[PDB]
Amino acid sequence: KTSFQQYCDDNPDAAECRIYDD
Amino acid sequence: KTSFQQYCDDNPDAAECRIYDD
Amino acid sequence: KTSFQQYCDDNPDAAECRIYDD
Amino acid sequence: KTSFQQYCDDNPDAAECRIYDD
Amino acid sequence: SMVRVAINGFGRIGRNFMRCWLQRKANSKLEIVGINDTSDPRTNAHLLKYDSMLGIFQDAEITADDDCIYAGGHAVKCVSDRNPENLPWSAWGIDLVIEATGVFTSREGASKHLSAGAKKVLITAPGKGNIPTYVVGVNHHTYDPSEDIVSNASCTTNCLAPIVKVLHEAFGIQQGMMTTTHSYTGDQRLLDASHRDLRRARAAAMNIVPTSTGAAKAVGLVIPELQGKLNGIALRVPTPNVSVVDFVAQVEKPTIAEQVNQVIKEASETTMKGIIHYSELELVSSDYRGHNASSILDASLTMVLGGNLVKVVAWYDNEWGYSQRVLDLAEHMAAHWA
Amino acid sequence: SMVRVAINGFGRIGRNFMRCWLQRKANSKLEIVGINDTSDPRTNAHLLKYDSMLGIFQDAEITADDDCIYAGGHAVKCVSDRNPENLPWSAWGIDLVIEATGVFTSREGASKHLSAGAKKVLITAPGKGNIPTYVVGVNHHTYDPSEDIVSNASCTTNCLAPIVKVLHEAFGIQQGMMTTTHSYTGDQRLLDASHRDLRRARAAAMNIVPTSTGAAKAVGLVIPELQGKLNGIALRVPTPNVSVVDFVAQVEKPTIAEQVNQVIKEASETTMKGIIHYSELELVSSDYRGHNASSILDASLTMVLGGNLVKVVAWYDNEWGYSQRVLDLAEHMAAHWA
Amino acid sequence: SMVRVAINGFGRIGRNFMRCWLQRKANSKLEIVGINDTSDPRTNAHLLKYDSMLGIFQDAEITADDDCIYAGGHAVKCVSDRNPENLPWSAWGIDLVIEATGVFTSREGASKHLSAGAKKVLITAPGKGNIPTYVVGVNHHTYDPSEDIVSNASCTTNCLAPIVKVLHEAFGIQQGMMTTTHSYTGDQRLLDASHRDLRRARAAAMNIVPTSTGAAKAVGLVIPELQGKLNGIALRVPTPNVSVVDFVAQVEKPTIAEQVNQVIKEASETTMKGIIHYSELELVSSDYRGHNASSILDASLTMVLGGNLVKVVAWYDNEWGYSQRVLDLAEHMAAHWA
Amino acid sequence: SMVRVAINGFGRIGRNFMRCWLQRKANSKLEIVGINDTSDPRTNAHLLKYDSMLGIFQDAEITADDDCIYAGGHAVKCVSDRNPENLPWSAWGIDLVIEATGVFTSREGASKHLSAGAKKVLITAPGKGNIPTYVVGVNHHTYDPSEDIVSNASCTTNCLAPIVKVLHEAFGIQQGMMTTTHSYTGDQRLLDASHRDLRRARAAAMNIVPTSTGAAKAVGLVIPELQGKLNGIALRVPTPNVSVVDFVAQVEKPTIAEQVNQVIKEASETTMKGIIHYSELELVSSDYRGHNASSILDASLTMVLGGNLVKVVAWYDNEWGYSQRVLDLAEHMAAHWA
Numbered sequence A, B, C, D: 001k002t003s004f005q006q007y008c009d010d011n012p013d014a015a016e017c018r019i020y021d022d
Numbered sequence E, F, G, H: 001s002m003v004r005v006a007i008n009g010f011g012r013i014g015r016n017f018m019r020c021w022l023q024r025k026a027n028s029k030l031e032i033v034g035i036n037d038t039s040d041p042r043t044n045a046h047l048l049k050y051d052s053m054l055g056i057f058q059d060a061e062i063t064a065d066d067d068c069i070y071a072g073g074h075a076v077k078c079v080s081d082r083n084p085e086n087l088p089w090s091a092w093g094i095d096l097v098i099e100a101t102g103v104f105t106s107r108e109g110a111s112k113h114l115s116a117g118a119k120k121v122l123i124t125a126p127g128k129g130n131i132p133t134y135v136v137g138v139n140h141h142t143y144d145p146s147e148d149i150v151s152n153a154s155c156t157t158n159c160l161a162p163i164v165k166v167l168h169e170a171f172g173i174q175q176g177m178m179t180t181t182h183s184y185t186g187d188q189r190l191l192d193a194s195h196r197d198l199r200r201a202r203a204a205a206m207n208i209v210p211t212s213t214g215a216a217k218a219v220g221l222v223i224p225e226l227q228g229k230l231n232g233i234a235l236r237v238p239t240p241n242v243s244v245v246d247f248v249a250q251v252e253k254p255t256i257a258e259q260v261n262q263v264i265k266e267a268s269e270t271t272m273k274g275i276i277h278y279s280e281l282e283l284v285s286s287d288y289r290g291h292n293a294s295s296i297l298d299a300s301l302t303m304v305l306g307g308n309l310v311k312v313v314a315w316y317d318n319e320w321g322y323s324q325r326v327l328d329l330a331e332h333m334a335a336h337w338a
């Protein structure tokens, strides 16, 4: 994992990570 | 001190926390 | 013709009248 | 006096002419 | 007897005014009986009912035929003639015209309604020339029932003048500067396009657009002591409604932010009740949609420097709040009608 | 020698066209010598130079006096008459009029320019009635040099028709439906206001606004095999420029998304080079500002179901890309002049 | 007695849901007793009361202290822990969690609420993995009372699925493609900024932004006959709420636009009453703010080609309409509780 | 030897700064060799190239691999750690960190970069506490090369301070009030959502949003004579870039609008060349995208009352103009580096 991939696993609600299936 | 206050101390770049002095 | 229909015949470029087929 | 000036005298409500003092 | 009203120009102000009256109809001395506008009754009824800012009109059914619109079965006759001299004002027995087109703001222009038979004209805009100008809550009690043409000033003047009156009576205003950060209005173009004013030419929802304004100077018409002592500008921004006045004044009596706020709060509870609202809440422009006050002081923004340089900031719903004031002025004229 | 051009209507398309020509004039058979517009030279020059979408014009100095605008020393005569029959086309030696007002799209209307002295008219919009219609890259080589009034179709037709032609020749289009999610344009009102079209009446930067469109049916004019086989709609949304077409076709030859993309990519490199661009990048509308292609296929969005139901999605700069095609068509006419 | 509810994630859906319940609580089997969110009670109460889309909450007073928010005297306990395993669901006697954070959509994630003491979880989003999915009006009667984690699907699935069910039962859907022109949502960035999705990274109010969507494929979860037969995409546009789905279907029984409209109208009056509304009015997105239907068919936009290629277009308030359906599903679970 | 630069925080300012340097690279004493950011190199390269405000980067090819981004084949190493104490500054030989995250603006926070091995830190924001603060063109010649942490102030302070310096030296500023009508920035939420600041919580593209600001007080740091004599506020509005300062000052020497404009014009041609631009044109915010000045005086808006109350209005590109100043300050530090 990259640091970015790990960050989104730990903080899926972070602004860089949110995916809402509209 | 509240949980929200601790959250913003720990994550000042979080979307709920950012204060840019424009 | 109504007054409005006559107005748009006389002024097709008026704001109340413009129809651009996008 | 120009044609544009006469147009706005004759049609002050035209889109090219409206001046609302906000 | 009801005062018979015709609306000339069924635009943002004409339709906001109509909705204001429909909600206040039970207590009204006015009866809206006619509309003149560039468009036809079916279009007018559609736009009265379906409003991007106000929502769908809830209080009564709105319908139309070839000749009239109906609001709760009450008929409003419609005509479409851009020359007021041709309008059927005598034939319809019109007492008062609400002049809301934006284009008959001079005495010569507004008087065309008198020629067509109306008894009085209320211009929903600053007058050009020697037209008596009123701000409800500031000088409307000076209205003379013999006047045939009056102006209700602008939205911005209606927001600024009550605040100025309170500050002047408490501290003595020596000079003052204003900027209104104002929602875009229908005189601006949607995309860059020809206009005799090069800034109104520019795409309204894409830009901050400066315009000159007479709104601050006009406060001197309704507070004559301050003639020539006020000036300002407008910045139109990409919101469709709700505006804010920022006023910076030099005052005679030294003060501090807390006192400035207390004076305005006290007035809002007493002499300016219903005209000024005092807010200590941290709100934003959308929250003031539909507010009935002429001015909502944002108390958190008040500041003073050196005792004598005072900044206050006040919100206003430029469509709805102003239209409430148009209706208030018209009801005042009706109450004093000979 | 040079074909002398007048622009009638110095609006979004008229000014984009002028800027396209100013950048390409070194290889041009056209000389823009005149402009007719509602406004005066000062306003025309200001809006040509300062553009909310294109930015400040970089390539040459733009000035004006009472009679002309000037672009890098090139003088362009100006007139302001909304009746084309009165225009000075004989006196100015005008060969070709670019008809960009939006209001002279019938043969009767456009022919007023011929009565005034022009030799040909190129309408920057679909024609109304029996007007030959061209899309560069699709059928412009069929231009008949004896024609006096032609149409360059619409922005949406220029985006859709090249893609449809490629898909039809590869797979056989039996039927197709289109929706364009389109930037707002100057026919819509800034705030809710009178309009003969009740959806165009509504505040453009606040709403998704459906409108009917002839763009899909007009593909049948430039690809005659497909007459009657296409239909669709427009949804105007709160962006000021750049649009996207979504096209769902029923095709005869069964296929899959990878093959649809391969066919369009191959065309973009050969038969449709400069007309269709093929993109595998994850971009958004702003990134296509100023793109010179008529259609940019967003390859990541292609999908197929059941072999025969194909969806493709293509971007287009509806102001700039379309104006590049107007210039291409005008140059083609100038090179085949009779 | 009452099913005790906690909201996890007091965002757009969490707060819309709360307002839906506050308006419907007189007939409810639910009692909202707790909220968990990143922020504190003061912030929760402020945003519940003051809403840029819904306006100021009218029905009851909204206040807060350090521990709770209060809606018309009803106290709602508040906590702030982003790890659901730590939440006080046992201590508060929580029966049902409304999972509205957007981040606990797998069974593993949502089950953390069960470990903390809750009995069931309703995810306000498509589930990831093997989670039973319901659309009220389509398959909610199939609810199995033994299920502990369920999904209410997405806003777009709730709009599309009812229309698809009606069209499938009348004409037989063989394949279908969807595009939603959708208001921007909180997963997009305000200005270009880091995001694992390169299109969601881009300035949301400035751009048309394509995103993939599972909404069409998810219709196959609630209408199992159609598994694998639907696909589509989303285009996010610069409006803050209200969306529209464009659906192009290949159907077995040949038809025409008038018959498609008649079938949907009949369903809207009977089997789909309250779920599909049928509109013949020429409206725009703002007019559908606050609509309670899952789908509003815009009948003027229906078209058919060649008998089998059907296009329908339907509006939906993606915040409020969807939240009404979340409440409907929660009430259904409460009435079938085990 | 080049001064080796790392950017901490590759956001709007970090990426504007990078583009400013790439365009000015030939004359630079700086070499940008590293980036730390929350995201990965491929995302950073994509956002550097594709910008909703600046357009596609034209001057050099931008690519990326797992470890670096490349601009014209020149490698910039990338890392992703939100704790600056862990950053590889000694390992990369970093001389100067551009601190552009918004979160390390105190001496304790910025000093974490020094602990990690960097020699100096330039904070792209007002400092908290005893951090020396510079505005290029106002006090940057007071920079002491022994200072290890400096602040370049805010965009608003960089716009206001040059104007204040010119007005103070010409007329003597006694007190002054400011309002900035400012484009929204990345600290505001896209839709109403949790925030410790209740106004930044609100939907940024839908509202006029007041915020407190230290920008006016900060002018007293760079013009020490005016410490305590200036205050103001901010109104964030729905434009994505470009802002305007409105400044109202009490001055000692009586003046008139014409003299105020002439003094600023003279400074813009001499002592403030490149920092203040003087404009007599009637432009709007979009026209100032990419302007390199810190302040563009809009001369048409200047007004004076009673000799001593002065209003001036100045535009600024808050992203690009400010980033030009960050680069100017960094180049100044490099020119004086021991």
Ligand SMILES: NC(=O)c1ccc[n+]([C@@H]2O[C@H](COP(=O)([O-])OP(=O)(O)OC[C@H]3O[C@@H](n4cnc5c(N)ncnc54)[C@H](O)[C@@H]3O)[C@@H](O)[C@H]2O)c1
Pocket (backbone or CB within 6 Å): D013, D019, D020, D021, D022, E008, E009, E010, E011, E012, E013, E014, E036, E037, E038, E039, E081, E082, E083, E100, E101, E102, E103, E124, E125, E153, E154, E155, E185, E186, E187, E318, E319, E322, F193, F194
């Ligand atoms: N919108 C505001 O915030 C606001 C506030 C206060 C005052 N005003 C003033 O009210 C006036 C109207 O503003 P608005 O915002 O309603 O504008 P608008 O453009 O929405 O409405 C003007 C209406 O008058 C019609 N009209 C124009 N010329 C006409 C003519 N010759 N005969 C009949 N009808 C005609 C137009 O078709 C339109 O329906 C202006 O003077 C404006 O300055 C506006």
Ligand SMILES: NC(=O)c1ccc[n+]([C@@H]2O[C@H](COP(=O)([O-])OP(=O)(O)OC[C@H]3O[C@@H](n4cnc5c(N)ncnc54)[C@H](O)[C@@H]3O)[C@@H](O)[C@H]2O)c1
Pocket (backbone or CB within 6 Å): C013, C019, C020, C021, C022, E193, E194, F008, F009, F010, F011, F012, F013, F014, F036, F037, F038, F039, F081, F082, F083, F100, F101, F102, F103, F124, F125, F153, F154, F155, F185, F186, F187, F318, F319, F322
């Ligand atoms: N904007 C687009 O995306 C686009 C794309 C393709 C085609 N078109 C078509 O091009 C045409 C113009 O569109 P636009 O967006 O440039 O509109 P616009 O409103 O920006 O420009 C029209 C111009 O013509 C002027 N005008 C109107 N009536 C006139 C008259 N009688 N005489 C002289 N000048 C007159 C107006 O003042 C204005 O300057 C329309 O037919 C439109 O459908 C527009």
Ligand SMILES: NC(=O)c1ccc[n+]([C@@H]2O[C@H](COP(=O)([O-])OP(=O)(O)OC[C@H]3O[C@@H](n4cnc5c(N)ncnc54)[C@H](O)[C@@H]3O)[C@@H](O)[C@H]2O)c1
Pocket (backbone or CB within 6 Å): A013, A019, A020, A021, A022, G008, G009, G010, G011, G012, G013, G014, G036, G037, G038, G039, G081, G082, G083, G100, G101, G102, G103, G124, G125, G153, G154, G155, G185, G186, G187, G318, G319, G322, H193, H194
């Ligand atoms: N907005 C819509 O139109 C819409 C419609 C249907 C479904 N949805 C779905 O609903 C969900 C929420 O969407 P939204 O628009 O309300 O988003 P939002 O960002 O407005 O709300 C999310 C809320 O959850 C909070 N949160 C995030 N992580 C948390 C955690 N670990 N613990 C506690 N609280 C946390 C956030 O602070 C925020 O208040 C998403 O799955 C979305 O796809 C949204």
Ligand SMILES: NC(=O)c1ccc[n+]([C@@H]2O[C@H](COP(=O)([O-])OP(=O)(O)OC[C@H]3O[C@@H](n4cnc5c(N)ncnc54)[C@H](O)[C@@H]3O)[C@@H](O)[C@H]2O)c1
Pocket (backbone or CB within 6 Å): B013, B019, B020, B021, B022, G193, G194, H008, H009, H010, H011, H012, H013, H014, H036, H037, H038, H039, H081, H082, H083, H100, H101, H102, H103, H124, H125, H153, H154, H155, H185, H186, H187, H318, H319, H322
């Ligand atoms: N945007 C403007 O107009 C402007 C003008 C002048 C100054 N500023 C100031 O510049 C600073 C940044 O503003 P911006 O507009 O670029 O904001 P932004 O949100 O676009 O950029 C901040 C960047 O820093 C990253 N980041 C946050 N925390 C981090 C950490 N701990 N480690 C590494 N990276 C981190 C973010 O992911 C983002 O890429 C703020 O202090 C702001 O006040 C902004």
